[PDB]
Structure formats: structure tokens, C-alpha cells
């Protein structure tokens, strides 16, 4: 909190945790993920659902 | 509603403001719904307490003298769930989500 | 190419009084009406029209 | 209902030889000058008209 390099990048975050899979259905998404490192990602993305 | 030509009152509206995909979605129905009740079952259980038993009786609480919870704050580690438990506690009551 | 441009904007709500009030993109909201190409299953508040 | 638009205008500056310069709610200010209906001894600051 009380920063905007690491506040507004969370808020954005908070909407994706919650937008590709969240309240919204299914469609054809299927959503390929790529990243570098599972070390430094959010737990919401780390977990299966 | 006014006539563009020459601004002319034609009809009063309906005030219906801007909710645009902001309010209008209503959405309960599956694959999240009233079969998909397997928890983490207290937890959901708090909610109908909290929500559909005011709703669905309304009048238990005027008999007791209180008023219902203002709302139900979930929360809790990522997927374990949340969106679950809201959803189909929604579809059994059947209202303006 | 003197063929004229039709003019976008989005559905603010719909009123049951077979209008549908617009927000355009222009500035001003205009209540127009539907044709027989307009039916209420492809019109949603959010619809480009 | 089809009568000319009487646009409102509050009465921003005034001067002493007919002119009152009217901020019209459209954007912009206009000078114009008063018919004889109204006056220049009706026309005070804050005036809407
Ligand atoms: N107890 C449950 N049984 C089965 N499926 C579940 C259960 N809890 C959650 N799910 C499902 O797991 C998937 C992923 O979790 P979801 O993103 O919905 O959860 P959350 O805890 O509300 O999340 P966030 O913190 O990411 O906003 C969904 O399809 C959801 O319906
Ligand atoms: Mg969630």
C-alpha cells in the first residue's frame, strides 16, 4: 500500500484474478499462461480451477 | 425525449441514468447453481442465514426486533472459493443479483 | 464511395417503448428508433449499433 | 413546443451603452443587445435570462 509502482499494477492484478476465470463464463477460453518463474507470481494464478 | 428540430418536450423518459453492462448482467444460472452446493457447507450455510432467510422470510426478523446482516463478507486463500458459494446462493433465492 | 457513413455509438439502455436510447459517441444521447434488421435478442446495453 | 429555443445566457458583463454580454450555456459568451421588454435597470449580475 502507499506506493503506484506496486498498487496500480495490483489493482489491474485484482481484476485479472477475476476476469479470466471468474464471475463471467467458459467461452471458448482456454487460457495459455507463460511465464519465467512460479517464485514470483501471485498464488491465484499458481493454483488449479 | 425532446424533438431535435426544435427542442420541443415530447415525452417525458423514464430516469434510467447509465448502467450499461455495469448492472444489467444477471447471471446465477450454471455451471454454477443450487447442484453445486458441495463445500465448505457452513460456510455456505451462513450466507442462506445472512441472505436468502431474510428474503424468503422477511418476517421472522420483525418477530425477533433485529434487522438482517448488511452483507456477507467472504474471503479466504485463492480458488477455494468465493465465486462458488455467491452464485448459487443467488440462483436459489431468484432476484436481482 | 459517396455512399454515406453510418454513425456508431453505444446502447445506453433500452426503453420498452420500441426506442432504444443511444449514447453516441458524438457527445450528445439520442433517442432513435429500431427498424425490422433491430431485435431485442442481439441488443444488449453495451451493444455498438 | 415548436417555438425558437430560448437559450439561457447569465449576465456576465453588462455596459451602459445596450450592450450586455450574456455567458451563454452553450460554451462561448455573446454580446447582444436587450428588446424593449426587458431593461437594462432588470439586468443585475447573476441574472439568469
Ligand atoms: N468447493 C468447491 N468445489 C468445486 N469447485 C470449486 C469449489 N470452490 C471453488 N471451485 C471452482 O474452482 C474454480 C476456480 O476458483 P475461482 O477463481 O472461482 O475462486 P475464488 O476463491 O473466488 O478467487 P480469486 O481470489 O481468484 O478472485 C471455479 O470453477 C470454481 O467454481
Ligand atoms: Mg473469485
Redesign the interface.
Known amino acids: 500500500s502507499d506506493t503506484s509502482g506496486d498498487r496500480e499494477v495490483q489493482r489491474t492484478m485484482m481484476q485479472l484474478?477475476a476476469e479470466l476465470d471468474?464471475?463471467?463464463?467458459?467461452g471458448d477460453v482456454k487460457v495459455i499462461g507463460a511465464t519465467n518463474r512460479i517464485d514470483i507470481l501471485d498464488?491465484?494464478i499458481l493454483?488449479?480451477? | 425525449a425532446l424533438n431535435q428540430q426544435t427542442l420541443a418536450i415530447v415525452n417525458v423518459l423514464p430516469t434510467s441514468k447509465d448502467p450499461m453492462v455495469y448492472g444489467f448482467e444477471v447471471?446465477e444460472k450454471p455451471?454454477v447453481s443450487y447442484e453445486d452446493i458441495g463445500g465448505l457447507d457452513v460456510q455456505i450455510e451462513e450466507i442462506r442465514e445472512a441472505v436468502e432467510l431474510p428474503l424468503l422470510k422477511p418476517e421472522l426478523f420483525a418477530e425477533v426486533g433485529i434487522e438482517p446482516p448488511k452483507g456477507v463478507l467472504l474471503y479466504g486463500?485463492?480458488?477455494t472459493g468465493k465465486?462458488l458459494l455467491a452464485?448459487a446462493v443467488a440462483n436459489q433465492t431468484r432476484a436481482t443479483f | 464511395l459517396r455512399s454515406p457513413p453510418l454513425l456508431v455509438g453505444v446502447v445506453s439502455d433500452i426503453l420498452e417503448d420500441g426506442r432504444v436510447v443511444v449514447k453516441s459517441s458524438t457527445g450528445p444521447k439520442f433517442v432513435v428508433n429500431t427498424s425490422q434488421y433491430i431485435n431485442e435478442e442481439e441488443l444488449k446495453p453495451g451493444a455498438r449499433v
Request: net charge neutral; no cysteine.
Open positions: 484474478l471468474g464471475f463471467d463464463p467458459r498464488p491465484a493454483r488449479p480451477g | 447471471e455451471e486463500p485463492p480458488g465465486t452464485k
